[model samples]
Target: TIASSRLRLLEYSAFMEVQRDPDTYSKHLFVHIGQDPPLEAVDVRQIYDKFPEKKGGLKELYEKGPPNAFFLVKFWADLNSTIQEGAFYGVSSQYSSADSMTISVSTKVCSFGKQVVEKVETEYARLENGRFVYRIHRSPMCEYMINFIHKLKHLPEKYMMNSVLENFTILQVVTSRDSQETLLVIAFVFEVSTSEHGAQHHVYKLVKD
Candidate 1:
């Protein structure tokens, strides 16, 4: 009962790819919302009944749930292409509501790149509507740039460096409430000559084991 109640608090709707064990052929569910152990070991049989029957219907089903509620659906990665473009299947769950999420940029950033960098250059922190914004700038160091780009390569958004750009900039905004914390990451690359830029943002909610 306690776990079920705590599960309600992490009601963000999202899905993750299912990993099948090579020898045992067992499925392991790893949802991204909070990395909660209870979800990682959820019985797939109990949730399979929730999967969409029609082709390419999983996407609509995953996003169909109302806000501030818990729902999950699982699909085969092999058939994900036929199901939905770039779609991952497995456990589905909801996230914390925006009204309760406290978003703010962090002043001290210790573990950004390979080299120890400190303090984000906070030009201004503006809260508009429900979103929090903080403009940041950094000096381009060759060593930092190379290593940082390499690090970004492994992230979900690998297409970040696909276009032409002069400089890469990153900002971290931490969101929290009660004992849970979610990290909002902002990354952008810009061209110094034409003032053109491209940016990507992500929110990660992970709980400590």
Candidate 2:
């Protein structure tokens, strides 16, 4: 049941941030979708289905999850500790509504290079209020599958995720989804328990020489 595709896994319409803790009675996923790209219903529905309280809103959905909510505090901490603002990010999510949008799951649809490199900043900074804010930057990678990147201490690393120290080849494209649209290079691939046949940019593949 673990459907696989690098494009669908990494590629996100926008970045999303949630509270470190939600009120016990609250059933809402207060996602802070940042200044990213647009999202349709297909993206919206899936994002919603990826939370921990997803029955109401989040979980470990392919490349997704939650609590009162969650954000990738470590990855950025590493970046800030290592590169500061020099480190850029791609915000991603899945949600839409009557008056506005709701980022159910922080999706990463990084389907480009120069185009995305142009906008890698995230808006989940200085957002602390006794809440442990984390992050969800999206866009697609031809390498990892759809796995949410969280703190390394709490969980082990897997495809679609890793600690920021270990970097992978971020695929570039002209369009948001397909390389065929611009005839540019493509991103990662398909995965399964019995077999995994596709390109894989293991961490550090893009390490500086």
Candidate 3:
């Protein structure tokens, strides 16, 4: 039997207790490397099966890629007599075999821009390997800003359209512990009419074995 009081208590507990600790709750970020299909494969069902409760629809499961190859899944669940919206899942392959990769979120003029930034930042910090493996190159923010400019042609239309032409900027930060350091990358993408294209930067960090 499902008790109403017990259910409410569980919901409150999840939001207040479990959700508060980034380390314990932030597995949503980072690529599920082990679940990734080989560079050449037909389906990713093997990977999706691991999270049965958070399954993606068949249509989304069919698309594969080397770019933003992450799989985002949405679901619907029934608890008692109420229907609850399912969670969203982003699954990506490791940037490289060594786990050295750049992390950034889009900051467009959309209504959810701020939320998107927070999601990426929180998730990045929560990952198990949130450490700098190399020296701080240029300003972390500047490096990511330039990355957007370099990919202008490839950026989505929603990110590039605006009547006022507002320029986009990505705020970046660097952290170092002992001989290792990792760059915290952040970018805010908005519309801009300026002719100066942003710069590009790269960081070579060591991935923990």
Ranking by TM-score: 1, 2, 3
**Per-prediction TM-score, please?**
0.22, 0.19, 0.18
RMSD of each: 20.2, 18.9, 20.0
Estimate the TM-score for candidate 2: 0.19
Q: Model 2, stretches more than 4 Å misplaced?
A: 1-14, 19-148, 151-167, 175-209
Show how many residue pairs clash in every candidate, following the order shown.
9, 40, 8
The number of the candidate with the highest lDDT is 1
Candidate 1, superposed: residue stretches over 4 Å from native: 1-97, 107-116, 120-168, 177-180, 195-209
lDDT of 1 by residue, 41-92 (tens): 2322232232322442222322442212222222111111112122233323
lDDT winner, 1 or 2: 1
How much is the lDDT of residue 130 in candidate 3? Answer: 51
lDDT of 3 by residue, 108-188 (tens): 222221211212221122223553222111112233322333355344552353421243222222222222223221122
- Which candidate tops TM-score? 1
lDDT of 1 at 118: 31
